[PDB]
Write a protein that binds this ligand. Structure first.
Ligand SMILES: C[C@H]1O[C@H](O[C@H]2[C@H](O)[C@@H](O)[C@@H](O[C@H]3[C@H](O)[C@@H](O)[C@@H](O)O[C@@H]3CO)O[C@@H]2CO)[C@H](O)[C@@H](O)[C@@H]1N[C@H]1C=C(CO)[C@@H](O)[C@H](O)[C@H]1O
Ligand SMILES: C[C@H]1O[C@H](O[C@H]2[C@H](O)[C@@H](O)[C@@H](O[C@H]3[C@H](O)[C@@H](O)[C@@H](O)O[C@@H]3CO)O[C@@H]2CO)[C@H](O)[C@@H](O)[C@@H]1N[C@H]1C=C(CO)[C@@H](O)[C@H](O)[C@H]1O
Ligand SMILES: [Ca+2]
Ligand SMILES: [Ca+2]
Lengths: 588, 588
């Protein structure tokens, strides 16, 4: 066999604790190279210490091939052990029938394996629930709605910035425009969100900051006055909670804005500033050479977000900075009862900080949701001691590439399978899935205003293990290129809203919350049934939910389902190009 | 190529920070499948943000094949980046000349790679020295000596246990014997240790406990009275330090002895004990059915070390237990200035505890040495936030198997290479190498009293990257099977000591401390030069230290070295079976 393609990494996503007495174990092999895998596993000490003749390796446990990413196959088994100590090894058999044992000591013929020595085996030494990954149950039942607050609704003209423009969803906004959106506007349209079936609101930054996006924080302890005040934000969280809607805020801890008191003190006092070591300043005075692009300087003497001199990086290794940020993070949860933090540029802040942050948040709220914004693979933040999940950009990015750019269905399934095998099973169910955002082009623009394609993308994404999110205005078909064009004033004029798409989104949210989310410890199955034709299945012990997506150029016939949940063709058997059909059936 | 055998895991031992501006990156490939690897790497933001035409991917960096374990090849490069942000991907070319790019997004033809998108790449997002692994420099210059204190020297008959036996190194000790060894005996023989050239003492447990080995702790805050008292232990540490000898104590935190006040309170008060939740008790009252073996019960109602009812496991997830143990760990360092902790059964205690332990010890002593006793691979404890190193059982175990059991030299080199590539480079230089201990058979018994073979094993081990240790009495050729037979009273009678071996050990310790340890950022090279013939090289920029080991059945001729450091044959060119020769030469 292909020995170089076989790997087990102990104490990782390949070997982890699920509950007090139960672990999940995975093995990677080369694709279709290994025909079968059995696990030899038991209490390490039982070998030497128990007087019985029985030994744990005499009774293998069958592992199951669960996924393939086109390069590797992934195998998994669940193991229960009352002594809460586990030694294990793998019995692998290849296509020609060559069998070997694979352990911490390498590859062996079965006859040459020292199976009586506990130190031969891989080890899960004691099952430690304090170290395990935990997923908050309520996230399972959530569909999120992302609000960029300057652009959702102006509920109060009296707090509008100078130069506020008339509200017009057909505008192409500039980088520095203001339209007057605020917290009162969100409060005014909570009925719309409840009627859509939303159960969680994700807000972009709302703290005091000079810009329209407010990622250049001036004061983390104050609601921006053009958005509202403390009383109004408390009123908003309570009204959301009254409707069964959770609230997630944006924490921008990697950098601070240059109009903050801290940075301004650095500019005044140089290295004698009490805040000098809160930043990353290579040479004093802190300076840069301005360019014609507000967001770019080539030679700042301090580290920044990207190359923008207005966003000096915070030194989160400094204990004064750790204390400052933890106090901010605690304040908004303890005083306003928010339910989750979305962490801006989370990957550029150290693990030491994130572990302290995790500890603080879980002590306040055991079911808190910590969501990191990271575009690349994020295994090291998803062990169970830092974040709950990350933005699932790679996963939704593959979905978009398939629907928009003519990839093979095999390629998409390979990519999604790869993603799932990066992380623990429970982690995958917490990942945050959005097909667009305040940073990227809008769905309807990506789809070149093909509404059928947009519906296909949304439905496919809403069937995935992670939790879905709708960017404000998706439900009415709003268009937009990249930032700032993806930040148009919300469309509230009915003559400009796509009512068909709104009705469809209501139905899809209901399939997600009432059908998919109520499955019990379901599995997902990806089947490539034809050229650009995919069957997705979610199934538990009683119920199977099947979706078929025809994204080729021919018609596809399927058996008439007894119980159709959602479809785009009027036919109950025919799927034209870009049609899909979702149905439910009992498992026999 | 063999794509299933290529892997890079970001934020691991394959991608880690060395200093403020410098990282080390590794790639795994299938053995001899990939002919060359180049790294494409630079600041992720420079792609989009800098106005220049130059892009970081246009200038590859060559990676070097550093090791092979017989299954995989390992490649490495060091990268410097002033912006302290790194995006990277790998250019891999196989034996047929097929080249592909390998990134976080998978494998691509170079023409199909989105090299302008920072999110295509693997990422080291910001170089965080607070998260990095740090090695204490002083360990580099150490040779350790392990003392099992009951058996090293009786310096005070007046503290002897009842039933103490006459001191006799030819005895075969029983499990429950006492010979009266104590702290005063160690103090009395510090001259012997200095003369041998030892610079660190590792003590087995010395705290109050009823047994001869004292792993069944009764009181962690008191020196066992048969060994000494606080004043005497302080005197011992000061005299050791005066001689340039560091001190490491044994921390037995996984379990406590059943005669402790805590456990006895559980036996008296059942679940109403203030200490009930300090343990892992499944059913009250805490009980077991005794057997004829003191160390075994089949049915204890509480978790234990192994299956011994006298060693109840501590619940280190309980914050009262965390506080109790951290106070013990702090007390011995702060009040007695010890230099290191050896952690008994360290793998069975949770990471959450070990991180708090690490933080406490480093705050007391930035150069503290934390050594975990773990027999299996230990990557998850060696990231930089928990232990400094582990006992290197797998590494010395492979060495022993080669010298004693006729393996191929290829097999040994494969195993050592595997070990080294599990861990960060600096970690490998902190690993603790001993060929025997209070738990295993003695070297001279393993060697069937073949002194030449014992010398070969010791010399080969002392040339390795990790720090070496001598178990008390190895220097005089003491024999012994497994525990308790490996715990004989130290041989102080000159007529019973092997003086030749003592002289040899002095010379070998001097080669280690004065030659090998004074190399500057050296590399190690393993060459298989014949059947059971190995050339080991340690070389820096000026100096090369070469050792040749002939462990076949024929004579081996080598070129006469100009500067021989150590050899066993009288010839300067001939190596008979089991001879070795060590020399030094300048690098040209
Ligand atoms: C300067 C920039 O600030 C704001 O951008 C933030 C994003 O909205 C956040 O989602 C987050 O995204 C960054 C990722 O964390 C990071 O890993 C990398 O992928 O880049 C992302 C940003 O592209 O962090 C950002 C900083 O807090 C604001 O929303 C955005 O409008 C701001 N301007 C940039 C975007 C446009 C329009 O101004 C470009 O033309 C500018 O050159 C950029 O300055
Ligand atoms: C009961 C046992 O206590 C003492 O043993 C300790 C060892 O000396 C330590 O080095 C450490 O070794 C254990 C490893 O951490 C663990 O991962 C596994 O490899 O087993 C190792 C022990 O084999 O931890 C031990 C517990 O603190 C003491 O030194 C030893 O004499 C004691 N007895 C055992 C050894 C012999 C002779 O008594 C056997 O015949 C007994 O059945 C055992 O009870
Ligand atoms: Ca307003
Ligand atoms: Ca004594």
């Amino acid at each position: 066999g292909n020995l170089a393609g076989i790997m087990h990494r102990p104490d990782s996503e390949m070997a982890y604790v699920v509950n007090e007495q139960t672990v999940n174990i995975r093995l990677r092999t080369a694709k279709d190279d290994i025909v079968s895998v059995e696990l030899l596993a038991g209490d390490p000490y039982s070998l030497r210490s128990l007087p019985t003749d029985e030994k744990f390796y005499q009774v293998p446990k069958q592992m199951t091939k669960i996924m393939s990413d086109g390069i590797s196959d992934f195998w998994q088994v669940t193991v229960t052990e009352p002594k809460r100590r586990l030694a294990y090894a793998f019995l692998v058999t290849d296509m020609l029938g060559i069998q070997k044992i694979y352990s911490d000591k390498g590859f062996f013929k079965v006859a040459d394996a020292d199976l009586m020595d506990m130190n031969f085996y891989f080890r899960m030494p004691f099952f430690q629930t304090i170290d395990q990954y935990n997923a908050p149950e309520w996230v399972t039942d959530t569909v999120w709605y992302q609000i960029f607050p300057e652009r959702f609704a102006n509920g109060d003209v009296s707090n509008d910035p100078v130069g506020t423009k008339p509200w017009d969803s057909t505008d192409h906004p500039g980088r520095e425009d203001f339209y007057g959106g605020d917290l009162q506007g969100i409060l005014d349209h909570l009925d719309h969100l409840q009627e859509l079936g939303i159960s969680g609101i994700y807000l972009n930054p709302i703290f005091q900051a000079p810009s329209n996006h407010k990622y250049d924080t001036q004061d983390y302890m104050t609601v921006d006055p053009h958005f509202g005040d403390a009383k109004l934000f408390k009123q908003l969280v309570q009204a959301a909670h009254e409707r069964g809607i959770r609230v997630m805020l944006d924490a921008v801890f990697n950098h601070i804005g240059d109009k903050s008191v801290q940075w301004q003190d650095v500019l005044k006092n140089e290295q004698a500033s009490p805040y000098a070591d809160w930043f990353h300043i290579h040479q004093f005075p802190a300076t840069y050479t301005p360019t014609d692009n507000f967001e770019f300087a080539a030679d700042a003497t301090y580290d920044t977000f990207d190359y923008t001199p207005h966003m000096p990086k915070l030194n989160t290794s400094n204990p004064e900075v750790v204390d400052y940020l933890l106090n901010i993070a605690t304040y908004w949860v303890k005083e306003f009862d928010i339910d989750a933090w979305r962490l801006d540029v989370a990957n550029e802040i150290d693990h030491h900080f994130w572990r302290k942050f995790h500890d603080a948040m879980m002590a306040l709220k055991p079911d808190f949701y910590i969501l990191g914004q990271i575009w690349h693979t994020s295994q090291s933040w998803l062990v169970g001691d830092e974040f709950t999940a990350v933005m699932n950009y790679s996963y939704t990015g593959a979905i978009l590439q398939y629907f928009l750019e003519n990839e093979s269905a095999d390629a998409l399934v390979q990519k999604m399978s790869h993603q799932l095998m990066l992380y623990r099973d429970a982690t995958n169910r917490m990942m945050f899935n959005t097909v667009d955002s305040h940073d990227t082009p809008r769905l309807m623009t990506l789809a070149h205003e093909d509404k059928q394609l947009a519906k296909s993308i949304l439905t496919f994404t809403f069937m995935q293990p992670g939790v879905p999110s709708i960017y404000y205005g998706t439900e009415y078909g709003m268009t937009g290129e990249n930032d700032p064009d993806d930040r148009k004033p919300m469309v509230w004029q009915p003559e400009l809203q796509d009512h068909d798409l709104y009705d469809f989104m209501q139905k899809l949210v209901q399939v997600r919350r009432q059908v998919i989310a109520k499955l019990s410890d379901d599995k997902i199955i990806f089947d490539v049934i034809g050229e650009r034709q995919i069957r997705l299945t979610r199934e538990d012990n009683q119920t199977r939910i099947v979706g078929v997506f025809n994204n080729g150029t021919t018609d596809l016939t399927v058996a008439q389902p007894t119980s159709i949940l959602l479809k785009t063709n009027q036919s109950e058997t025919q799927l034209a190009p870009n049609d899909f059909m979702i149905w439910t059936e009992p498992v026999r």
